Design a protein around this ligand. Structure first.
Ligand SMILES: [K+]
Ligand SMILES: [K+]
Ligand SMILES: [Mg+2]
Ligand SMILES: [Mg+2]
Ligand SMILES: [Mg+2]
Ligand SMILES: [Mg+2]
Ligand SMILES: [Mg+2]
Ligand SMILES: [Mg+2]
Ligand SMILES: [Mg+2]
Lengths: 372, 88, 253, 218, 260, 254
RNA sequence: AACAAAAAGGAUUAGAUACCCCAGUAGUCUUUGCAGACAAUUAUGAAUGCCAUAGGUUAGAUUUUUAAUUUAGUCUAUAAA
């Protein structure tokens, strides 16, 4: 019954703009700044592009054409729109290269994302048919639920004392009746197990008496109870009797849609030298030197801890442009908060020399001149 | 804490002192000279370097005025859009 | 299937829903900065702005296009008014097609109600069925008062309301692009659409330009067959009466 | 009343009457304006008549004294819920630029989601996943999660090959004497140098400022 | 979207009588160009190149490494159709002006014949062999032969991806190895830093590809076979191709300055 | 919008219709982009080659040829399907129906209704009508297919004309008395629809248009009526020959 | 305790009851009554039905609680009037 004009808008490109997702979650009790805000952990608005011809006119498929002062001249045309029409009759926009190019930088490292491992390194891919699964069935047993990553219930350890009370009085309290039915289904199957077995050599599931007594038998073994309660509220397992239980489930996909590579078990064949041992190094910056009990380094837009090891010790104003060292990214993963934590590992000497050779800035060429 | 209010309809949105008011520098230098005279004394020896600094300013040429800050022009543009409107 | 300067090199005769939606002719203003009066064209609310119904735009656009055609078919003087940074090429092109007058700057208040002073020195001429000068009206082009547009086609009624008021004050029909926050009672024929878009304005103006062009064509085709689709205006008509009076004296005297 | 009495809707009525008779009683009325006959049979449309707007969602049946009856309603589709879910699971999918500038508007004519994610005219993005998800959920009678899993997994495989081509493309190109320009990584670091040096200057100045400002405390 | 277009003289339905059967031309152009374009469309389905022509994509999408994979499909589609727009249903007689100039740069029509053919087999890889017209500010128009590995653009605006030398066997420890090695790095270092090794006139008019020869496997692996026994094979494919060159059209693109 | 229209009392009936026609075209959303003319091209040509005779026997005989495999027309599927439906209806109605199609082309609108009354009055006494209606709508298709008094057209011998009987008004049924006396031979204003063959023909006999210049003539006269370009193109694909190249276009009939 | 009409002193001033100053009693406060006047004001009696929006704000409610709907108040700026 939709009108033809209303049927075109449903599939229009503008109507496809995703809603502004909540910002990257941070500690609920901090002193965040209000007037000034730095770049976020992950993007929140959709980045836009246009044709080189339509950009010279300021046409971005928006309400009105954007100004040419800050929208033309750059190589990569990227822009974010906070409001298509604000109270000032202007499209409140801003450059989107902060996050747009950071994705391109990270995708130039050629590194997959793997599930974190407690401290024999085992980098298991995130995109697998055994772990990456959201759909389920009620009949499924508790064990497979650990594999999942998208739980409907909240994380108890993460919730604040106020949020916890609200959850109890608005999600758990008005569920006793339904929970009683859930037990009946379990008790029903229990009666069928003995019958089926003896028959080799289900009931209507309506017994309000066994249920009450069934819960009094589990008061001495709280473990099996929580195991059952976690299935009715879809809570992330917390006790070892494990995966991502230290910081809780990932609010997003374990890869967070930043890289879709499954493994890095490849050897880039170099033209002259041949198949190299490790991956090409990457130059990074130095932020917050040791002399804060750790050093921060900027590896392709992201901030990660320095390798476990001058340069990191003290700051040096004389160095122009700042201290820049080469380094190899070993492992990358997404924490519960959504940040992209990189296991930056010190690079080798030959790798840097080989990689600089193509750039043409290598002081001494390994090819030919090198006698030994 | 509440957020900044939406200004009522004003005749003209502007700032009185568009450009900062520059304070005569050595008026402070004179204060130091006067201070030393109070503590040390008028016909003393430690006041030489301070008194000589006061003579240095008057001889030195005054700086040139800064370029006007065009802030009232942009405020007049977005007045009707930022506030409730204009009144007359 | 899309060139930026396609609405100028070859504007379309009629604009379909796709063309109007592709030109952002439905992006209304913010929900807060709306005019409840023109809630008859709004379709819904998305992205915090009012969505103008695509069908409502096409219907009013075709209607206005018919108005421009007839007025040009009856020898009317049309005026295309677009006063914005990037609307100069759009208005000039539309005028060429419809053989009309353009205006891409701040309309001087009092050019219709006080035309005697403003448009005093601008020269005029006298044409005929086939739009060619008629020698013999030299004395009439000095006592004649300036002209007024028989139809104004505004592309930003919200900005310039002094022009549209003189049109209603001087009994002149008008056409305008009414946005979500523009009063629809300022113009005679509304065209609910997005006026802040330089791509929709080029489309709407192109369609109206073709209308005038098609109208002018019919008029000239009917003039070559000895069928004039317009009679002498009242002003010039009076001169003929005076001409015979002065000529009558020569006959007797 | 800051407004003015507009009569743009009555230009024909007023003009038609003024041209009915002559001001000099006892003479034939002069010819009317040239536009009077052009819009004779085209009366203006009705304006300023608040109708019942289109209801895009069931109105609250419990409200006994409803307000805002003449207010346009919000447009919500079933996709909105799905788009929010997906893009929250893949926040870095928003860094992939997406053009919302329609070319001709005829982009929904060749979209058949029964084939797969890849379609004609639209790029592989979260939207294709949602539309594909919605299709499976409706036609194939799948659940929200089930349809989400299937379509989502196809999205991954298509993105993996895309990233593999880039690496293999540049690598293979150099095997036959192919050289490229400055990669994005190197360029990014260069710009930081120019910006970091500017910060050093400002820091040095303000540092010296405080030192000179500390001499006055004593 | 980029869509396949017809061939010059209805070769899709009939094909060249003595060079390629209709079936071979079908699999070579209609069933391959379509595949390449299908991939190309998916790559530029939502970028600035959604409406750009193949050549514009080639030149524009050349230096940037991140878009290397787009260059291949775009360039391949261009070169492929560039190779079919120079054949003819019947052999054409070489133009006089062209015939003369050829001898002045290669010595004879047969000298150039065996050079291009010889270069093909020498490559032992899929590539395109061109016939380029070189010109400099004061130097007269001079022709030369160029070999492009896999997808290689002969134009000077795509020098980054010229791919004229296989680094595998052309860079060793011998005297030639070191020489080739230096050039390889000299180009990379120059290109990376933005320096220009060889000045080129604006508009890329120094080099104008006149004729081409597709040596890819799919083109000839069917009609001429594997080539075991020398009967047919890649060699014969190049030979037969030399008889269908539309020398008339070749002369037109040459645009030789009147000097006779 | 139709309510806003206020015509003048001195406007001719033609003017009033013109205003509405132009107003109804303001709400046109455009014909579908994929749906093609169903009865057009081949199928349309087949209809003119099998529905020009005055006897059902000849008509069905022609369809059988088209249905027979290898027919030049290429409408075999349509032809076969059509026959299946023609052999499932009352044979009496077919003869009677076709009879008035040839006689109704010369009657007036007023005379038509008067004859149809007497014509329909004899159908109430007929057996087919009382049987078909009862066996279809009333029974809701129960008891299987209806049973016409003549089982099939084959039963009706060639030399027998059953059509004539109905076309004889009886004195028992009084002549229909209409509410007025207005009448005519052809519709006064039936030109609002898409151009048909009559319009395209007239245009060619009064002009020197080309294959592409003729389409623009109709698109201009109707000023963008949806489907004019497609309709006119179809007419020029069935009854238009390239007699003098692109210079002129003539009809195939000649 | 403090403040402070009155009474009184010191100044100012042409004169100074005054304004200013040193001090100072009723009174202000507590309990029980009288008294009933106020710019006791929103210069707008109380109450009911009804009329288009926007930006804040107060106490709640609902929700995909991020941010939007919504009930009852309050205050700015407007449309029709
Ligand atoms: K006193
Ligand atoms: K309020
Ligand atoms: Mg606007
Ligand atoms: Mg006191
Ligand atoms: Mg009392
Ligand atoms: Mg009081
Ligand atoms: Mg009272
Ligand atoms: Mg209050
Ligand atoms: Mg007020």
């Amino acid at each position: 019954g939709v009108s033809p004009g209303g049927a075109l808008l449903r599939t229009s490109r503008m109507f496809s703009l995703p809603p502004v997702i909540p910002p990257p979650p941070g500690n609920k009790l901090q002193m965040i700044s209000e007037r000034a805000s730095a770049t976020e952990a992950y993007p929140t608005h959709q980045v836009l592009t246009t044709f080189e011809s339509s950009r010279s006119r300021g046409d971005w498929g928006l309400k009105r054409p954007l100004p040419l002062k800050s929208t033309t001249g750059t190589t990569y045309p990227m822009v974010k729109v906070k409001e298509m029409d604000s109270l000032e009759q202007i499209t409140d926009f801003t450059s989107g290269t902060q996050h747009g190019l950071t994705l391109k930088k990270f995708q130039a490292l050629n590194i997959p994302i793997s599930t974190p491992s407690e401290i024999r390194p085992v980098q298991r891919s995130v995109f697998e048919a055994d772990t990456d699964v959201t759909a389920f069935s009620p009949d499924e047993q508790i064990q497979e639920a650990e594999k999942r990553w998208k739980f409907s219930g909240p994380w108890l350890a993460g919730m604040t004392p106020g949020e916890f009370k609200e959850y109890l009085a608005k999600t758990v309290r008005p569920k006793r009746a339904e929970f009683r039915k859930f037990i009946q289904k379990k008790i029903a199957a229990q009666k069928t197990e003995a019958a089926n077995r003896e028959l080799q050599e289900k009931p209507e599931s309506i017994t309000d008496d066994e249920v009450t007594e069934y819960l009094r038998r589990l008061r001495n073994d709280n473990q099996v109870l929580y195991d059952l309660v976690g299935q009715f509220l879809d809570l992330a397992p917390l006790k070892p009797p494990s995966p991502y239980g230290g910081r809780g489930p990932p609010i997003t996909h374990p890869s967070a849609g930043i890289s879709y590579l499954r493994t890095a078990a490849y050897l880039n064949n170099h033209p002259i030298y041949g198949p190299q041992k490790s991956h090409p190094p990457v130059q990074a910056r130095v932020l917050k030197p040791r002399r804060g009990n750790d050093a921060k380094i900027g590896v392709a837009g992201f901030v990660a801890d320095g390798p476990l090891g001058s340069v990191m010790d003290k700051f040096d104003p004389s160095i122009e442009g700042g201290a820049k060292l080469w380094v190899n990214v070993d492992k990358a993963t997404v924490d519960s908060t959504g940040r992209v934590q990189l296991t930056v590992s010190d690079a080798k000497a030959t790798d840097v020399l080989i990689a600089k050779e193509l750039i043409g800035d290598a002081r001494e060429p390994i090819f030919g001149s090198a006698p030994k | 804490p509440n957020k900044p209010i939406r200004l009522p309809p004003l005749k003209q949105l502007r700032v009185r002192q568009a450009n900062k008011a520059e304070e005569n520098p050595c008026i402070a230098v004179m204060s130091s000279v006067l201070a030393c005279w109070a503590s040390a004394g008028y016909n003393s020896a430690g006041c030489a370097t301070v008194e000589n600094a006061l003579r240095a300013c008057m001889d030195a040429p005054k700086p040139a005025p800064k370029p006007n800050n065009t802030i009232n022009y942009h405020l007049s543009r977005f007045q009707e859009r930022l506030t409730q409107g204009k009144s007359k | 299937r899309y060139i930026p300067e396609q609405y100028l090199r070859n504007p379309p005769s009629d604009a379909s829903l796709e063309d109007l939606m592709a030109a952002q002719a439905h992006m209304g203003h913010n929900t807060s900065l709306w005019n409840p009066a023109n809630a008859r064209y709004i379709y819904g609310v998305r992205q915090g702005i009012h969505i103008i119904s695509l069908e409502t735009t096409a219907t009013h656009l075709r209607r206005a296009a018919r108005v421009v055609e007839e007025v040009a078919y009856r020898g009317g003087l049309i005026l295309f008014v677009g006063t914005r940074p990037g609307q100069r090429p759009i208005v000039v092109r539309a005028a060429e097609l419809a053989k009309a007058c353009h205006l891409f700057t701040k309309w001087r208040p009092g050019t219709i109600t006080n035309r005697e002073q403003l448009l005093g020195g601008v020269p005029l001429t006298v044409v005929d069925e086939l739009d060619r000068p008629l020698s013999g009206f030299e004395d009439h082009l000095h006592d004649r008062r300036p002209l007024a547009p028989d139809l104004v086609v505004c592309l930003n009624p919200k900005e310039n309301m002094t022009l549209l008021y003189e049109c209603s004050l001087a009994k002149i029909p008008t056409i305008g692009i009414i946005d979500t926050n523009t009063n629809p009672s300022w113009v005679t024929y509304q065209i609910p659409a997005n006026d802040d878009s330089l791509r929709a304005t080029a489309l709407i103006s192109g369609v109206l330009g073709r209308a005038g062009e098609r109208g002018q064509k019919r008029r000239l085709e009917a003039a070559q067959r000895g069928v004039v689709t317009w009679k002498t205006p009242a002003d010039v008509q009076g001169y003929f009466e005076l001409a015979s009076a002065r000529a009558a004296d020569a006959r007797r005297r | 009343g800051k407004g003015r009495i507009f009569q743009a809707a009555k230009v024909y009525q007023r003009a038609s009457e003024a041209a009915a008779t002559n001001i000099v009683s006892g003479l034939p009325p002069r010819n009317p304006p040239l536009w009077l006959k052009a819009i004779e049979s085209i009366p203006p449309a009705e304006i300023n008549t608040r109708p019942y707007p289109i209801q895009h969602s069931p109105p609250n049946p419990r409200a006994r004294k409803p307000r805002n009856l003449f207010r346009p309603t919000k447009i919500v589709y079933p996709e909105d819920e799905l788009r929010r879910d997906f893009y929250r699971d893949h926040p870095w999918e928003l860094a992939r630029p997406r053009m919302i500038i329609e070319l001709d508007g005829k982009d929904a004519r060749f979209l058949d989601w029964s084939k797969g994610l890849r379609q004609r005219g639209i790029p592989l993005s979260g939207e294709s996943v949602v539309q594909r998800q919605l299709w499976l959920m409706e036609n194939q009678g799948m659940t929200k999660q089930e349809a989400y899993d299937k379509a989502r997994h196809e999205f991954y495989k298509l993105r993996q090959l895309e990233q593999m081509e880039r690496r293999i493309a540049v690598e293979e190109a150099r095997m036959v004497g192919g050289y490229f320009g400055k990669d994005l990584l190197t360029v990014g670091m260069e710009l930081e140098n120019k910006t970091y040096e500017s910060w050093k200057k400002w820091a040095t100045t303000e540092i010296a400022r405080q030192e000179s400002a500390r001499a006055s405390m004593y | 979207q980029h869509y396949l277009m017809p061939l010059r003289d209805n070769f899709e339905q009939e094909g060249i009588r003595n060079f390629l059967s209709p079936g071979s031309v079908n699999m070579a152009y209609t069933e391959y160009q379509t595949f390449i374009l299908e991939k190309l469309n998916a790559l530029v389905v939502g970028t600035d190149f959604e409406q750009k022509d193949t050549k514009s994509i080639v030149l524009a999408t050349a230096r940037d490494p991140e878009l290397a994979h787009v260059f291949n499909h775009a360039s391949m589609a261009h070169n492929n159709h560039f190779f079919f727009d120079h054949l003819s249903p019947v052999p054409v007689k070489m133009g006089d002006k062209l015939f003369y100039h050829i001898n002045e740069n290669f010595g004879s029509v047969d000298t150039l014949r065996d050079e291009m053919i010889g270069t093909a087999v020498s490559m032992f890889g899929p590539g395109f062999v061109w016939l380029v017209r070189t010109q400099l500010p004061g130097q007269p128009v001079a022709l030369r032969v160029m070999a492009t590995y896999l997808a290689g653009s002969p134009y000077p605006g795509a020098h980054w991806r010229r791919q004229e030398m296989d680094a595998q066997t052309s860079i060793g420890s011998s005297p030639q190895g070191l020489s080739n090695g230096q050039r390889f790095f000299e180009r990379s270092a120059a290109g990376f830093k933005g320096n220009k090794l060889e000045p080129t006139a604006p508009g890329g008019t120094d080099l104008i590809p006149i004729l081409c020869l597709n040596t890819w496997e799919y083109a000839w692996l069917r009609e001429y076979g594997t080539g075991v026994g020398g009967m047919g094979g890649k060699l014969a494919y190049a030979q037969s191709w030399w008889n269908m060159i539309d020398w008339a059209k070749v002369e037109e693109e040459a645009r030789l300055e009147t000097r006779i | 919008r139709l309510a806003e229209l206020t015509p003048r009392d001195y406007w001719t009936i033609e003017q009033r219709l013109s205003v509405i026609n132009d107003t109804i075209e303001e709400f046109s959303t455009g014909v579908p982009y994929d749906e093609n003319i169903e009865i057009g091209g081949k199928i349309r040509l087949a209809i003119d080659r099998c529905f020009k005779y005055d006897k059902i026997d000849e008509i069905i005989a022609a369809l059988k040829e088209e249905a027979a495999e290898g027919a030049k027309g290429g409408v075999q599927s349509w032809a076969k399907n059509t026959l299946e439906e023609l052999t499932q209806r009352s044979p009496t109605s077919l003869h009677v129906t076709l009879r008035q199609m040839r006689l109704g082309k010369s009657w007036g609108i007023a005379h038509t209704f008067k004859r149809e009354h007497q014509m329909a009055a004899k159908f109430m006494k007929s057996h087919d009508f009382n049987e078909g209606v009862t066996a279809l709508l009333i029974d809701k298709g129960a008891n299987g297919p209806a049973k016409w008094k003549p089982a099939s057209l084959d039963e009706i011998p060639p030399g027998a004309n059953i059509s004539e009987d109905y076309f004889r008004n009886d004195p028992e049924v009084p002549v229909l008395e209409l509410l007025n006396d207005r009448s005519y031979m052809q519709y006064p204003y039936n030109k609002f629809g898409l151009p048909n063959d009559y319009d395209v023909k007239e245009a060619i006999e009064k002009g020197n248009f080309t294959r592409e210049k003729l389409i623009d003539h109709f698109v201009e006269t109707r000023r963008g009526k949806q489907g004019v370009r497609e309709a006119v193109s179809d007419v020029l694909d069935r009854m238009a020959v390239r007699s003098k190249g692109t210079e002129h276009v003539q009809w195939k009939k000649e």
